[PDB]
């Protein structure tokens, strides 16, 4: 038994002052004057009390290049916890000619004992031959997985043809699974990529100009069209640019079940930061690339008027030295990815709520709740109500602080928002009503995290 | 020397009454005040049809298209058209020159009217990208079909599609696309068989408009990315006109074509008892009647700008019969070459959807300027080849197999009451048809070597 009193609680809907009362793992009662017989106090006067961040886009301990992502399931989840997030959903990668159960098995072992907070998996689909379509039944029922990434880019590495894409959409309809897509046209990027090399433009900046917004717009559009044709449901990850928001809007006007996600870097960074003398642009090499500043407003507007509806990290980080160095000679060999898991929550807060782009209630919805409802964790996660796992987060909105590698908790040598002056700070984080962070101290234990078995798809 | 007097001449721009004067193969002077007279009092005098979408003597299935380059071009001439552009099909692992060679031989001696070639592109590996220079300079070819559908038969991936667009930019070639998503159609197709829906009607429901809208959108997006120029063939539905419109508003060089069947027929005609729907099996399929208005509006306000037949005909007996058991085997195609000109007239001008001037532009001129045959073809001016057509707008007549000139057992517009009739057709100032008689000779037709791309 724990007792948070003094807090102003904030959810996707409600904003009120009251004490919450946790017993075991779950919130149990909310109000004035509860029955707190002999239970641990926690003072939350002055602070906001909010549900835990859910971060539906994480690639922890992944290979990309012959090298692996810096954070593991321990370093990763900890950093998430530090930066306000209590539950992640990671991308289980399948390898053509692939026991689907054996890939999953691998991702479980990658977590077990390391993870401090709760976590779930998405399942990547490489080919959708008869073999794989069969296995999908097992996984949705037994293995607690009900969402499915298809990459339309990374040619000869992860890329899938329209066939795979469509068969997977129609199955997903049949089984009740959200399909997700990395919507860029591999084929046009490969050509532009191999051409820019032909001409000796090897700098990291040419990572951005070799995958123009027109190519995201196109694949997003395409993936929407098949979803329409299949009668299925879509979640475009990482929308970076206006060309795609346009395509998502358009479909959601015709009432189809299309969904959208950004990340902070597209909300808070632009291309100009890559044009930088020495290898400094490799800090920003990730896909889709950073875009022109015009697009930040459009992305924001979309979140605000409910056109996009979740925010993830796409945390996939690599060290500037040694790792992002593989590829001094050419940008194709820069492993693509950023360290974004930690600051996410608070940049949403500081740049968004605090400068009047979204409401405080939307900030929760956009970082926590809506991601639970799409990925079938609701109401175990993503809210403060009676029954809900006690994934609470006390949050002090008055602190002003500068984001930095000197002070962050991810296991990497840089921070893409290095130097950003920012409001808000994570005081304490509970996961199923146990401290992971207290007064900004790691009091958690490795292995405490539990796998979340998600339910099948249901609108919002 | 020939002398057409009494005519009211009609072009893409002009409408006036005057005598034109042909000498040799070319119009030579026009105006008021020992040469062969031809009376055109009462009739319209207009430039020859150009039909930029023909598949004459083509294989599809293990069978071939009914009309050859003789029967075909004659029928065109009968129905008002003087110059065609046919689709030279390339096979993977393909001497590009040898494919062309084959398409020349298919014509030589058979063709009665003038003709050119498009070049199909199957793969755009280094080999083929190299050859393309020879062809655009030497072989007179400056337009290129890539099919995005017919999986494992003609279909190209986005790679081939993009490379070709960027090369086209580089050489000055119009790229053309058949814009349906092969992949989604294959699934829907093999699924509709799984369930035992083998009637010809399921040809239409296995390739919904959404899939044309998609490939159209897609092929437009690459064009933007390549800075190259596009011509979507056969736009059948609103989903694609939408996509074309949108790009043209942003000022890219995207072009659009329909055919009469999509202006004048709808799906309901397929739902018909016995194998009668197979008469309408072709790709894209007939659409709901809502779309005909949208297509017509586009032509009118200059969103689409050309009209072709996609003439690719097969006999209802024996040939269309190939797939009584299942619609995948029905060779996809219609007999559309002959009536095209006059359905554009009667349904379009006559019922007040287009102007008389636009009728020429939409059937003749604009196709010349996009395919690089202008001003040799597609107008009545001093210098232009005398591909004239005397045209009587007052005749009422019923379109029928009993009376048509294509070498096939049916007519898809069979029974349509229609205004207008082709009296006489000149090709380079020689009669191909006189007072509705075939006075032409096989082999008289000449290959037209087209120039590179330039706007409009
Ligand atoms: Mn991605
Ligand atoms: Mn990702
Ligand atoms: Mn076609
Ligand atoms: Mn065709």
TrEMBL record, chain A:
Superkingdom: Bacteria
GO cellular component, one term: cytosol
One Pfam family here: Amidohydro_1
EC code: 3.5.2.2
UniProt keyword terms in alphabetical order: Hydrolase, Metal-binding
Residue sites binding Mn(2+) 3 per the record: 182, 238, 314
CDD domains per UniProt: D-HYD
Residues recorded as bearing N6-carboxylysine in the entry: 149
UniProt keyword Metal-binding present: yes
Cofactor dependence: Zn(2+)
Protein name, per record: D-hydantoinase
Lineage of source species: Bacteria, Bacillati, Bacillota, Bacilli, Bacillales
């Amino acid at each position: 038994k724990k007792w948070i009193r003094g807090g102003t609680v904030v959810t996707a809907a409600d904003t009120y002052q009251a004490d919450v009362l946790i017993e075991g793992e779950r919130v149990v009662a909310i109000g004035h004057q509860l029955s707190v017989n002999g239970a641990e106090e926690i003072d939350a006067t002055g602070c906001y009390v909010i549900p835990g961040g859910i971060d539906p886009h994480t690639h922890l301990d992944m290979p990309f290049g012959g090298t692996v992502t810096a954070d593991d399931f321990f370093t990763g989840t900890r950093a998430a916890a530090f930066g306000g997030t209590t539950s992640i959903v990671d991308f289980c990668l399948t390898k053509k000619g692939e026991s689907l159960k054996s890939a999953i098995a691998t991702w479980h072992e990658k977590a077990r004992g390391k993870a401090v907070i709760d976590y779930g998996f998405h399942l990547m689909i490489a080919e959708a031959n008869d073999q794989v379509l069969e296995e999908l039944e097992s996984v949705i029922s037994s293995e607690g997985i009900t969402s499915l990434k298809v990459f339309m880019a990374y040619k000869n590495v992860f890329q899938a043809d329209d066939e795979t894409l469509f068969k997977t959409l129609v199955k997903a309809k049949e089984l009740g699974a959200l399909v997700q897509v990395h919507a860029e046209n591999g084929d046009v990027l490969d050509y532009l990529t191999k051409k820019a090399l032909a001409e000796g433009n090897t700098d990291p900046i040419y990572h951005a100009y070799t995958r123009p917004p027109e190519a995201e717009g196109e694949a997003t559009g395409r993936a929407i069209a098949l979803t329409a044709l299949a009668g299925s449901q879509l979640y475009v990850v990482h929308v970076s640019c206006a060309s795609a928001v346009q395509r998502i809007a358009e479909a959601r006007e015709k009432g189809w079940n299309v969904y959208g996600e950004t990340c902070p870097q597209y909300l808070a960074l632009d291309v100009s930061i890559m044009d930088q003398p020495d290898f400094e642009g490799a800090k920003y090499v990730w896909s889709p690339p950073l875009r022109e500043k015009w697009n930040q407003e459009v992305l924001w507007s979309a979140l605000k008027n409910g056109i996009l509806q979740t925010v993830g990290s796409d945390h996939c980080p690599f060290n500037f030295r040694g790792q992002k160095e593989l590829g001094r000679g050419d940008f194709t060999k820069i492993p693509n990815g950023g360290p974004l898991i930690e600051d996410r929550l608070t940049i949403l807060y500081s740049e968004g709520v605090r400068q009047g782009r979204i409401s405080l209630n939307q900030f929760v919805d956009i970082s926590s709740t809506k991601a639970a409802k799409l990925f079938g964790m609701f109401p175990r996660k993503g809210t403060i109500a009676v029954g809900s796992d006690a994934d609470i987060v006390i949050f002090d909105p008055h602190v002003k602080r500068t984001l930095s590698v000197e002070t962050h908790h991810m296991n990497v040598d840089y921070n893409p928002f290095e130097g950003m002056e920012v409001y808000g700070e994570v005081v304490s984080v509970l996961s199923r009503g146990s401290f992971v962070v207290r007064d900004k101290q790691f009091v958690g234990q490795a292995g405490s995290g539990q796998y979340i078995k998600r339910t099948t798809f249901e609108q919002p």
